[PDB]
Design a protein around this ligand. Sequence first.
Ligand SMILES: [Cl-]
Ligand SMILES: [Cl-]
Length: 242
Amino acid sequence: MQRVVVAIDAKRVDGEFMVFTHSGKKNTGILLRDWVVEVEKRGAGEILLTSIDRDGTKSGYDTEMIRFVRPLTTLPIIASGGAGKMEHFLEAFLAGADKVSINTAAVENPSLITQIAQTFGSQAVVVAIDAKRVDGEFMVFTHSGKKNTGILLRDWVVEVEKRGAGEILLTSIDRDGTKSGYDTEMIRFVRPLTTLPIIASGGAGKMEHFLEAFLAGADKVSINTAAVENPSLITQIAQTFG
Ligand SMILES: [Cl-]
Ligand SMILES: [Cl-]
């Protein structure tokens, strides 16, 4: 149903789009075509699709990859930006994406939220926010969790709502900027600031881990490596929560 977002990182290797796990380092051997179909059947709510470059890092929209995934699924496809311009975004939507996910691009140019929302719709923008507590405040980090922007999480969540974001993808990050597990206190902190769906980005894969995020206030969880390694997690979450 609605509670599961599957994030899929993929790139063409050996002439096929293949699914990568562990921060885009491990070629799992799984065809993107098979995995997209299987996640839909297991009850995923939407797919966050990220094209990754030669060493695993987040690359820009791959329109061929978006067009390839499109006929396999009736779910919303969220294309994970990496890109900063109005024509960048148009290309993803023409290729088949239903939404784009932006993070550093949005932070550095907030009007991109507004521009995309104005052109493509109120459901078209996902803002991904990486954040951790520093100096006694939850602060927004950009550039793969490395730069403390100086922006309070509380201010940015409000601003992205006002600019017309459709959902927030929230990731708690650890001491060196990598994706950490659910921060329930950060989820509870963001809950009262926004009437949008909050997607908590997981970092870990056991079913009471997920319950805690939903009890903290998250409406959906995003899973990637945990789902690939144990695909029934998708089915379990969908069964319990929607
Ligand atoms: Cl192909
Ligand atoms: Cl606080």
